[PDB]
């Protein structure tokens, strides 16, 4: 292999990296011999490249419609329901003093709290980056590609967070009355039909009022209209219903719930810490950096309940302290009233101003946005999931 | 007030599953009624005309 | 936390509870340090709440159409049917005195008696409730919300009682001849078809005039049109018909009885005590209070046959003394002529006048109504249930 | 006199399970008709006009 | 007679293949008696042939639409994608110097440069090919017939290579997440139905960015739109879908994916060498000549990864050094994004000039073309294959 | 950019299998907004009109 | 002539009594020469009657006023009264909780029973009653006379029963406290005059609310106004009472003691069956028939407590089984408030339609009416009777 | 000394029993 290809003294990196360098040069002599670039007819000609394509893809958020723009002014918020009171027989043997005795309306209420701010950063060099691209137009495509990608990443993350929120709520918060078990896919599709009908009649079974402050003992009866019901299921199930249940049935004039399905391939894949891990190794920070966390440095503490959205389990500190939020088993259907989601976002002034370091000719750009995602206890939800 | 939206390019309708006709909020007890003749007399003893067999 | 956070003396409650209190105060000092409200930037500003939400839901009573307003004047009611007379041949051999011989019309009768008067109550503070809401408008919505909930509860309970009445009648009261048995759900669908056709013919088997007083000797033949027949079933059974039986049949052009079906999720869950149970514990009264029972107090006796309409079984006194009105075995299809239901109500002057306690600035309001629910033996009715 | 209501958003028709055409409240004997001439004459001998035999 | 026919001294071949030969010919008497061609009226006339027909057929390449004409000018091409960055929460306790820190955009790239310059040649004699055809019109047809057959071979062979490239990529390059196992054909059809839906979601599972240079640690999420998903399967599966699935299903409207399928009778059939094999045996060089490889000579080296496209395994040197690019188990459904294929071609000046050998009177025409086939890692792909 | 083409003479349509409605690219966050009143004042303190109770 | 008159062969009766009587009559010669009816001027003419008187004595029920028409449907009569409450002092020192105290009203009651229905009938013969009267007009009077005698009979019977009710009630069903004892006829007059005034006093002692279900414990003060007081005494006793000077002073004042005092000669003549007798002899049925009883037949059972209203003691079946309802001892004054005698009656369609036998030319007419007689415990009653 | 009143017409029931003017 020729010495020149191996030699690093002549690299551009060498010129920029060091304080003083050779101002004048007479060109080195190139040969393709015993190298990947060898050409039979002519050795001694530098390799020539035709294209440099961008291959940029646009991704979207399924749940964007739910997001509602809001001002960022105050932190807490609250909602309440007046709890049910059964009509009681007129005893008439009671003392006349009962008229005076006072009982007030009883209510159950929740406080949700403030949101979380998120940031992304990219810097464009204006010197070395120019060496990489043959034409000025290719470099401009590259810059827009970074901005375009940055927004797409945010959409993808928000979708993951909403999908994970729902899967976590069902797995942990739901009561026994809400939960149901499906032995097999055929049973599951039938169970989902039963659920749509069941949640359209008055029932206190599916409410989570008990978790709310005033519901420890008591009942709240709510009814959920059909338009609202929407179902989050794994794709395997939708494929089955369309491929087998719908195709085989003679009459499906009514009785089709596929408009409501929000099928996702995984549901699982968003991880949540437990046990308050503290970053301690370079190798750990390097993995996080690859996924975009410039901020992270050794000695920072990651609190319990932190949601990563990428697999950090293998790295040392998180080895036994990370848990995955996912459906348990292949069969999963969380059938819920749409009103429960509570997603709000503020995008005013999302793209922050550029900062230019004259030394090094680099401009750093930032994108900052606010997101609050939550789930309301009061509305109806039902989980049909694989039997244990 | 989130509103669910269509998630399919094409599908059959869901009318058969809909249970609005069976049970809806409109079907409820009416509280606008006023008291019967007996009640009005209990409250005010307005009517002093008749006492049935007397003397 | 700061001392102020936990200090009872600084509370508004103390001002109301004690007979004398400090008229003048110089305000206390607020800090968010080491408390849930901590704000990174300020650390000395009070927490701020953006919104408060009622989440009121309106609930209905399936059987409202049936209810008939009536005066509340007299305790008992009766219904009777004139019994059948078979045409006889002219025997001219008989003595002419037969003209004088007398034949009298005959009848079978039933007596159904008293009603039930039920009450609900709520008290509105005026003086201290105002502290809770930021705007007067939120507080006014709070008062409409308690009234609306109160009314919705009356509707849910009445529905539960009518549903329970039918389930209880079917399991216990129904004449043995009327009962029919289906081995599988597929058989049940066929059984329903046979019954709908059979009961439209002129026959005495379906009617329960035998139970009525005059039926022991003689016959009564009644006919029930399709326009009136109605079916009470669990939701899972209706789901079966729609998902599989209707979907699978090639031609359901006619032959669809699902218009008639009234389907309920639980079709049970109304509980009736089997022994006299005397309230004996504080914890028990507290559970009852949570469901709105202000009247309940220790030492009161609940007589046998009392219907709770909520699950009181767990409580100590009622542990072995409660039984549930429920279908047996998961196949229930009580098919009955609609005329049999007998639902009567009196809601005249339903919203009793308010009582204002000038001391304490409180007005307490009440709702009272009468309900009679019963089932008539005379009309046709056949139950299809799983084979025992 | 209760009467049923539909209770379903859409359904296939229920014709074919109905025997209204086969048996109905009508399809009953007519009470209203008066005696034939012979009967009226037995009740009161109104027709004194005709006797077949000659004097 | 048999003895005359047997003698090869009289053969035309002997005159053509030797330096000197006997110019004068004394005729050989021919008798048709007791031979297959005997005729009743004249028993000494040599048999006469009526037609000499060609039976030429035209074969075409399935994948021609994909091919893009390009000038053959430069060796390499490259393409790249920008890697995903997850949004990071605003710490706000980080040192204020973080603004100065520089975070650069990151990407993954691939270099694909290649060409193969495939050729083939045919020679028309003008002496001795005449001996074969009686009318000069058929002899001219024979010449056109070779050219057309040579062209058909180009088309059939390119198809084999595109088909083989795909089977090879799937069998070896794909990750565990992409791979799926199907026990039976019904299970497979459902899996194909599921994969179409899975690909439309946003997921990094089906991308092969990890193989690319910058993707070793990070993640890239891409979405594959329908209308750009083509599925490659065997005909046995397509036949199954049409015969037993599409035909039997009541509601196949909407659920038919057969427009996408690119079914081949047999996906396997192309062989790739492992190890290096020198053509030691003469018998081997002769076999390769049967397939049109005049170039092969004893002692030449066949490099690792050479793709034969015919079964060379039985030959001695290739006995253990050959491995077939093939589906495993008869169930194969490689579903992929169409964009991944990258087929390019240069066919300018395809029909090179003829060279007339004055000695031997032979023309020697040549056809040369350039073909580049490669598969891109970035786009989504899934393989459903028979369960091990 | 290769483009898939029809490989079959006639087929039932593929509509149901499409999630273009469910997760389209166009459904995405919007970056065109400008900062709110508070933000503009942080950047330039341009509003000096109101200081609340004063003097 | 004595002999001609004696012969009964020449009688209208013989012809009507038997079939095949004599059609043609040649008149019998008549002479009064030695008989009664002889006249100085014309010895031979038949005796001629100036008039047929038809004397009819109208008889009436004295108690007919104080009869309440009832329009009967249903059977029982309730008769409640509300018990007394005594006014109480203000007692302003008492706790303010006294405001709440039920103070429910209290009452007494008496369920009387149902009333017997009675009938009478007369058959009028067109054929032979005509022989008796000279002119048609006299015969028409005779028909009116029988109907009027029947009406007169209803009246005497009802009067007798009301009188007997009082005598029986006084002797047997009376509160012991009410009774008084009179040693001599003179003492009785003093006692009776003392009693008239006692009723006018407002006191609870005279009334029988102590019986009447209701309350033994409380008091009901009843007052009997003059004009509502009347004394049931024997005729001799009435003479003694009127004779006294007090009676004269009352009449001078304006109250007619004579109308008030009501007297029957013996207050006796109504008989009560004891011992459940049954008719057994022809002679008895004939006696009962003389008194108008067509219905009676041998073997009919007369229940204990049947009120005959004529002396049947002589007849054998009733010889030891009849007891007269009569005051015991000569002295008997029962002074009662007039309102006490409940004497409700229904007289609609009193004269039922006629029935024409048509053989014998006789029409039978019937009079039917409903009578209910009872005495109320609530009003003041005192009985003064001779000391045992 | 008043007397029982001789006649008034039959109640509605009486007339309908006699005629059965069904309606």
Author numbering:
A (entry chain C), C (entry chain B), E (entry chain D), G (entry chain A): 8 to 395
B (entry chain G), D (entry chain F), F (entry chain H): 6 to 60
H (entry chain E): 31 to 53
Reproduce, without paraphrasing, sentences from the article in which this PDB structure was first reported.
Staphylococcal picoviruses are a group of strictly lytic, short-tailed bacteriophages with compact genomes that are attractive candidates for therapeutic use. Here, we report the structure of the complete virion of S. epidermidis–infecting phage Andhra, determined using high-resolution cryo–electron microscopy, allowing atomic modeling of 11 capsid and tail proteins. The overall structure of the Andhra virion follows that of other phages in this group, with an isometric head (capsid) around 500 Å in diameter (vertex to vertex), connected to a 400-Å-long, straight tail surrounded by 12 appendages. The head has icosahedral symmetry, with the tail attached to a portal structure located at 1 of the 12 fivefold vertices.
The capsid is a T = 4 icosahedron containing a unique stabilizing capsid lining protein. The capsid has T = 4 architecture and is composed of 240 copies of the major capsid protein (CP), gene product (gp) of ORF18 (gp18), arranged into 12 pentamers located on the fivefold axes and 20 hexamers located on the twofold axes. In addition, there are 240 copies of a small 63-residue protein, gp19, that we refer to as the “capsid lining protein” (CLP). There are thus four copies of CP in the icosahedral asymmetric unit, labeled A to D, with A forming the pentamers and B to D forming the hexamers, and four copies of CLP, labeled E to H. The Andhra CP (405 residues) has the expected HK97-like fold found in all Caudovirales, consisting of an N-arm (residues 1 to 82), an E-loop (83 to 122), a P-domain (123 to 180 and 344 to 386) featuring a long “spine” α helix, and an A-domain (181 to 343 and 387 to 395). There is a 62-residue insertion (I-domain) into the A-domain (residues 276 to 328) that forms 240 prominent protrusions on the surface of the shell. CLP (gp19) forms an S-shaped loop that lines the inside of the capsid. For subunits F to H, the N-terminal 28 residues form a hook-like structure that interacts with the A-domain of a CP subunit. The chain then passes underneath the neighboring subunit within the hexamer and forms a small α helix that connects to a CP subunit in the adjacent capsomer. For subunit E, which starts in the pentamer (CP subunit A), only residues 31 to 53, which connect with a D subunit in the hexamer, were seen.
